[PDB]
Amino acid sequence: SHAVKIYDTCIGCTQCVRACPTDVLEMVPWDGCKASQIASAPRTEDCVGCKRCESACPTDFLSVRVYLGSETTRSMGLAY
Amino acid sequence: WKPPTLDPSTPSPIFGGSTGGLLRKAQIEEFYVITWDAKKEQVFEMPTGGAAIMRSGPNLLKLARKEQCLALLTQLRNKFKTDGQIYRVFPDGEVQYLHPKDGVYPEKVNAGRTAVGAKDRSIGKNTNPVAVKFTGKLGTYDV
Amino acid sequence: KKVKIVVDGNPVETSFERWAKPGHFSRTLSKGPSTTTWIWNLHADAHDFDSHTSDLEEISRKVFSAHFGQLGIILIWLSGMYFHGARFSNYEAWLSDPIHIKPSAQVVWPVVGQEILNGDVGGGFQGVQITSGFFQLWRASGITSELQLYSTAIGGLVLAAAMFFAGWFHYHKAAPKLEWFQNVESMLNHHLAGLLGLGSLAWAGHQIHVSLPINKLLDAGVDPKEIPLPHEFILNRDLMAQLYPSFSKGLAPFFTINWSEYSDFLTFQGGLNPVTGGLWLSDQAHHHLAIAVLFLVAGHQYRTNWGIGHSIKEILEAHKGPFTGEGHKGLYEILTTSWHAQLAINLALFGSLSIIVAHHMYSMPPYPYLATDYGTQLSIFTHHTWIGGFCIVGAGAHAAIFMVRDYDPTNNYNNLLDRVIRHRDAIVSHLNWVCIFLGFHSFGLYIHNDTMSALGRPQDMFSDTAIQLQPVFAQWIQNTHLSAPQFTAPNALAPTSPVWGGDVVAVGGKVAAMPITLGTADFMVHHIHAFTIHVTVLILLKGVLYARSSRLIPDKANLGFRFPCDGPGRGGTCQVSAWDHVFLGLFWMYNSLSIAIFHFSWKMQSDVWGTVNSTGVSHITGGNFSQSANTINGWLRDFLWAQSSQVIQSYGSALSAYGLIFLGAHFIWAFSLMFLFSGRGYWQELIESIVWAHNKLKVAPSIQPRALSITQGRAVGVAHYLLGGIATTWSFFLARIIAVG
Amino acid sequence: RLWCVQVKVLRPESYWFNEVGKVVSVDQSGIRYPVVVRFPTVNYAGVSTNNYSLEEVQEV
Amino acid sequence: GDFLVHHAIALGLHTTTLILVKGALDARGSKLMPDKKDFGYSFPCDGPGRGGTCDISAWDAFYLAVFWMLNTIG
Amino acid sequence: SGLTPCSESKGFAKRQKNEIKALTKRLKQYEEGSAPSLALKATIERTEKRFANYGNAGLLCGTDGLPHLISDPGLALRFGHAGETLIPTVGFLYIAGWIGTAGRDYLIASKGEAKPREKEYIIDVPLALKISAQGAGWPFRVIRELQKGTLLEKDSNITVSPR
Amino acid sequence: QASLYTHHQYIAGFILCGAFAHGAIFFVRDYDPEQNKGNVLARILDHKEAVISHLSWVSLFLGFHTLGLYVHND
Amino acid sequence: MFLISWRGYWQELIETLAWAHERTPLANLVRWRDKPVALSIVQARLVGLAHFSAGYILTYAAFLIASTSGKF
Ligand SMILES: CC1=C(C/C=C(\C)CCC[C@H](C)CCC[C@H](C)CCCC(C)C)C(=O)c2ccccc2C1=O
Ligand code: SF4
Ligand code: SF4
Ligand code: SF4
C-alpha cells in the first residue's frame, strides 16, 4: 500500500480530501492553523496513488505527500 | 449515529447489462455495493459505461472497485443532489461499511476523528536516506 | 416549422481593441501570462470555440465565418497558382510540346547560389519542375494562353475578397441565428441539388462548349495559337458543328427526347484517349451531366416548406429493430446540436473520399498527358492518400471530443450509441484479436520469407515460384471488369481502366496505363494494408469508446478530452486520454500510409511505368516487384537502397533541393524523438539551472520560463515525427521520379 | 512581521527561497505558520501566496 | 573533416556529461521536487501536478543519457 | 599545415575550369540573348569573380583544391589569414554583445513598470528602438558595470534548490 | 581492428554511463550532508546551477556551430 | 513502441483482454495466477532503452563486420 503523510504546513483547505477518488483522506480537528482542521489519511489501503491530492494542495511545499509503496489489488486499481 | 446495514433486497437500477460489470474478482476477492435513495426516476450514467435508469426510492448497485462507487456517488451528489452509502462485500458474506465512515462526509471536519499520517514538521525537515539505512523503515518519511 | 432567413443585426463591433489583447476569447487566458505556458495555451485554444463559450449560436456563427476565411485563403492559393502559371511558367511551350517539356511554374531568384534550382525543364525556360498537375488540368479545361490564366487569377482574388467580406459580414453585421443553422433538411437539399448538382451541370456545360472542341483540335495536331477562342465556339454554331455534327440540330434533340443524336459529344466509350492517355472528354461531359441530374433529383428529398419531403428525424426514429433497442433515436438531436459529431462524420467520409480519389485518378487518368508525367501521377496519389489519412485520424479525434463534451446519457438510453458503449469491451477485444491475427499472418509471412531466403531455402518461401498465395478474388474481379463491355455493360465500348487487362496504352513512347497483375507479393502487401488499417482503427475506436470511462479511470470524462494522465497510481496511467489515442493513431496511420505509398511507387515503377519500344515494354525497375517484394530485405535493398540513389546524388543539379530536404527531414524526424522519449520534469529542472544563470546576470524574464506541458511535448513530438518522415518520403519520391521519369 | 513589509524567505524547500515577498497578514492566535506572504511570481502550481513561520522570514 | 567530426565528438561528450551531471546533482532535489531524496533514485514521476513531472528522477537522467552516449559512440 | 596558396593550386584551377565547363555545357542549349542564356552567363561571371577573389585573398588550399581557413590568432596574424576567422570573431562578438546588452537593457527597463510581463509580449517599440540604438556602446557600459559590481546579482538574492 | 575498436568504445560508453549513475545513487542513498560539511563535495553541490548551466552553454555552442558548419557545407 | 506509447493505453487494452478470457468458453477453465497488468512506467523506459540499444549495437556490428569483410 502507498504511504500518505500530512505535514504541519496544512492550512485545512479540504481540497485534497475533495480531490481524492478513493476516500483515503479526511479532515480532523486541529489547532495548528487558522481553519482549525488538518488533513488525515486513515485509509491508505485504498490509496491508488493518483496524486490528485498533491495537485490540489496549495501550500509550498506540499502538505500532503504520497509515497508509492508495495502494490496490491486496490493500489493497482484492478477490477479483475 | 450508527453504521447502516446493507439490505440485499434493495432493487437495482433499470439497466440492460453491459460488458463493463463484475468479473471473477467479485466472486473470489471482494466487490463493492453503493446504495442511495432517489427522489425520482431518472437516467444516470453508469461508471462502467452506458445509461441506466435509477428507480424512485432506494437503489442498489454492485461495482467492482471502490473508485467506481465513489465516482457514481460524486455524480449523484453533484448532479442529482443525492447522498449515498458504499459498502465492501467479501466472498464469505461479510459486509464492511465504507463511506461516509462516521456518517459525515470526509471533507467536513467532524469531532471524534483522529489524525493518522500527521507529521509535526514541514516537509523540508525530513532526514537524509543515509540515516535510515539498515533500519527496516520505508524511508525518511517513516521516521 | 418554417424554413426562413433569421439573422441578428450588428452583434459584434468591428474594432482592433481585442487584437491588442491576446487571449481575449478565453476567461482564463484574458488575464495575461504569468509563465511561458500562456504563450502556447493561447495558440492551442484559439479555435476551440466550444471552450470559449457554451452558447451554441455563438459557436455556429464563429464556425460559419471561419469557414468563409478558409474559403478565402483557398481562393488566394488557387489564384496564386493560376498567376504563377501565367507569369512564371513554360505553359505555352509545354502546350506546343507536352511530351518532351517538363512542367515548371516556380522560378527562383539568383542569390546565394540558389539559381541552380532553375533547371533546364525545356521550352527555353528555367525553373523548378512542378508535380501538382496544373498544366494538364489547364489543358483539359481548354486554356491555351497566359491571358486566360491571368483572368482566372484576377477573378479568383476578387472571389477571395468576397469570401473574406462574407466572413466579416456574417459575423459582425448579419450573423444568422441558431435556428438558421439547424435547418439540416434545407441545407442538404441546397447542397445536393444546388451545390453539387448545379456545379456538375455547369461544369458539363463548360466541358461540352469549351473543353471538347479545343482539346479535339489539340489532339488533331492544330497549333494552340491557331485554335479558335472558346467564345468563338459559343457564338459560331457552325464552327461547333464542324467538329460535332449534332450541334447543327441545336437544342431540338434535347427537347424532343431524341437524345441519341447527341452521341458524338455525349459518349460512353470508356478507357483512355490513345493520343493523350487521358479519359475521353466526351465521356466526362456525359458523366457530369448524368451526375448533375442525379444530384438534382437527390436534392428534392427533404421537407422544408411545402409539405412534401422527408423528415430526417422520422427516418431515423423509424429505423429500429429487435437487436438494436431504440435504434437511431436521438441521433437527430446529436447531429443538430454537436458540431463535433458532424465534424467526425464529415472528416471520415472526406478522408476516405480523398483516398478513393487517389486510386481512381491513377487508374483512370482524367487529364491529357497526366499518365505519362510520372512525377505528377506519383505526387497526386501520395498527396491525396496522406490528406485522406490525416482526415480519418481527425474524425477519430472529433468523435472522441463529442463523446467527452457533448454526449448526454439522458438523451441516449438504449439507442445505438448507448448499446455500442455497453459492449465496448467485446468490440475492443475482438478487434485486438483481429489485429494480432493479421499481424502474425501478414508480417510473419515476410519474416518467414526472409529467414528462408537467408537459410538458402527459396523453395520454402511464399512466392510465385514457390508456395503460392494467389489473390484469386481480386483476379476474378479483374477478369470480370475486363469482360464487362461484352455482357454486363454492352453499351460501353471499353473497360473503365486498362488496369483490368487488355492492351498497353502508350503516349510518346511511354506507358500511360497497362494491366496491373496481382501475385503473391500483392497478396502479402494487401494483407499488410489490412493489418495496419485495422490497428489504426483499433487505437482510434478504443479512444472513442473509452473516452468517458474505463475500468482503470471511472470518471475519465471529468478529466476532459485532453489531459496527460491521472498520476503514477493504479500502476501508472500515462496517456489514458482520448487525445493520446489520437496521438498514437497518428503514428499508426503514418505507418499504414507509408506502406501504401511505397507499394504504389514500387508497383508502378516495376510493372506499369516504362518505355514502350519496338520489342515491348521496358519498365523503370524491370519487374523486380514480383521477385523481391516478398521479403523485408527485398524492400530495403531494391526499393529503399536502390531508388534513393537519385536523391543522394542530386547535389550539383536542379534536384539538389530534394537532397537537402531529404537530409533535413531525416534531421527533423530524429529531432522529434527527444520530445517523444523524454519527459518535462527533466527539462523543467534544466530550465531551473539556466534560469539561475540568467538571474545571475540580471537577464531573467518576467514571463517565467517553463518546460512544455506533457500534452504539448507529445504534440510537438508527433508533429515533428510526421513532418520529418513525410518530407523524407516526399524528397525521395520526387527526386527519384523526376530523375528517372 | 509588520503589514506590507518586504521579507526574505528562508525556507529551503519553498519556491521563493532567497526571494523577497510582501507580508499580507500575520495571524495572532499562535498558529504554526502565521505570516502570510504575497509574491510577484507564481510557483509551479500557479500559487502566489504561502504561509511561513516567524523564523522562516527575514525582514529586508 | 577531422576538425568537424572532433567537434561533433566534443558536443556528444559534453551533452552526455551534462545530462548525467545534472541527474547526479539534482538527484537529491530541485525547485520542482525539493524532497526528491525521499523518493529514491528510481521512481516514475511525481504526477501531473505542478505542471507535470515526467522523467524527473535521476534514473530518468541516466535513461536519457544512454541515448546521447549511443549517439556519441556512434 | 602543408597547404599551398589557392592562387597557385592546381586543384583550385581545375575546379574553376570544371565548374565553368559545366555551366557552358548548360549554356549551349539556349539562344543568345534569351533569359536562360543571360542567367547562365551571369552565373559564369560570378563563378570567375569568386575564384579570382578567393585566389587574391591569400586563402590556402589543400590537396582537394578547396580553401582551408586558419583560426589560430598567431598563424593568422603572421601569415595574413586574420580575415578568415579573427576579424569575423571580433565582428560577431561585437554584434552579439550588442544584441545581448539591448535585450538586458529592455528587460531591466520593463522590470520597473507596473506590468513587467506586459512589455515582454507587447513590445514597447519606441523604447526598444531607442535601447537598440544605444547598444553600439555596449562594451564601455558592460565593462563599467563589471568593475562596479552592478552587473551581477548577489548570490543571496537568487533562488536555489535544497542541496 | 574495426571490431575491437567499436567493441571497446561501446563498452567504455556504457561503463561511463554506469559511473555517473552510481554517483547519482551515492548522492541519493549514501551522501551525508552533515558529515561532509564544507568540503569539496558539499561545495560542488552548492554551485551545481553554475556547473549545469555552463555545461548547457558549451553543449549549445558546440551543437549550434558544428551543425551550422555541416549544413553550410552541405 | 515502449518509448513513445506509455502505460495507460496498454492497461486499458489488457483490461479488455482480461474480460475476454473470463467470458470465453473452453478458455475460462484455465486462469492466471498473477493478474496481467501493463508494464510499469520505469520498466517501460528500461525495456524500450534495452530494445533501442540492442538494435543499435546489432545493426552497427552487422554493418561494420560485413562492410569491412566483403572488401578485405
Ligand atoms: C526539448 C524538450 C523540452 C524543452 C523545450 C522547450 C522549453 C521549448 C523551447 C521552444 C522555444 C525555442 C523557446 C523560446 C520561444 C520564444 C518565443 C523564442 C524567442 C527567440 C527569438 C529569436 C524569436 C520540453 O519542454 C519537453 C517537455 C515535454 C516532453 C519533452 C520535452 C522536450 O523534449
Ligand atoms: S494519491 Fe490519489 S487515492 Fe491516494 S490519497 Fe492522494 S488523491 Fe487519494
Ligand atoms: S490540500 Fe493541502 S493544505 Fe489543503 S487540507 Fe489537504 S493537505 Fe492541508
Ligand atoms: S510519467 Fe508523466 S504522464 Fe506518466 S503518470 Fe507520471 S506525470 Fe503522468
Side-chain angles (χ1 to χ4, degrees), chain C residues 160-291:
Chain C
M163 293 289 183
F164 280 116
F165 173 79
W168 166 83
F169 182 77
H170 283 311
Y171 193 79
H172 293 275
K173 307 299 276 164
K177 294 203 229 294
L178 179 54
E179 51 166 339
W180 185 89
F181 286 100
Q182 289 178 323
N183 280 293
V184 288
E185 276 93 352
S186 171
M187 195 167 321
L188 278 166
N189 274 358
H190 279 87
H191 284 175
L192 285 162
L195 177 60
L196 298 173
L198 291 189
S200 200
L201 182 57
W203 184 246
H206 180 96
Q207 280 193 309
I208 285 157
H209 290 285
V210 175
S211 283
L212 261 75
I214 289 177
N215 273 267
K216 185 174 214 290
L217 291 173
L218 277 168
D219 305 354
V222 189
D223 182 72
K225 319 167 80 36
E226 315 292 305
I227 293 180
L229 295 171
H231 62 267
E232 286 330 319
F233 292 103
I234 287 291
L235 296 159
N236 195 4
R237 196 198 244 120
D238 307 351
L239 198 85
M240 204 44 164
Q242 276 160 32
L243 300 154
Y244 302 98
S246 70
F247 262 81
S248 62
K249 315 175 127 70
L251 282 185
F254 175 73
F255 286 112
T256 58
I257 326 297
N258 283 287
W259 289 3
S260 78
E261 309 273 356
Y262 293 152
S263 270
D264 44 350
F265 73 97
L266 291 183
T267 67
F268 219 117
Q269 291 165 102
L272 301 179
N273 193 358
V275 177
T276 66
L279 295 171
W280 294 102
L281 270 185
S282 39
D283 280 9
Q284 304 182 33
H286 194 190
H287 166 90
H288 280 116
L289 171 54
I291 282 303

Side-chain angles (χ1 to χ4, degrees), chain A residues 6 9-17 27 39 53 56-59 63-64:
Chain A
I6 315 286
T9 48
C10 168
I11 60 173
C13 68
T14 75
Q15 288 332 314
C16 64
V17 180
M27 323 288 300
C53 48
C57 199
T59 70
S63 304
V64 50

Side-chain angles (χ1 to χ4, degrees), chain D residues 24-42:
Chain D
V24 169
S25 67
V26 180
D27 178 87
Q28 308 294 137
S29 40
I31 63 169
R32 313 229 188 158
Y33 304 94
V35 187
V36 181
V37 189
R38 158 90 29 190
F39 301 96
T41 59
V42 302

Side-chain angles (χ1 to χ4, degrees), chain B residues 12-21 44-55 61 63, chain C residues 413-414 418 421-423:
Chain B
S12 266
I14 303 148
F15 193 47
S18 83
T19 62
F44 71 103
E45 184 176 1
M46 296 279 312
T48 62
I53 302 183
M54 73 180 107
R55 313 204 210 238
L61 202 46
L63 292 170
Chain C
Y413 178 73
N414 208 34
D418 182 52
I421 293 157
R422 275 158 53 199
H423 74 301

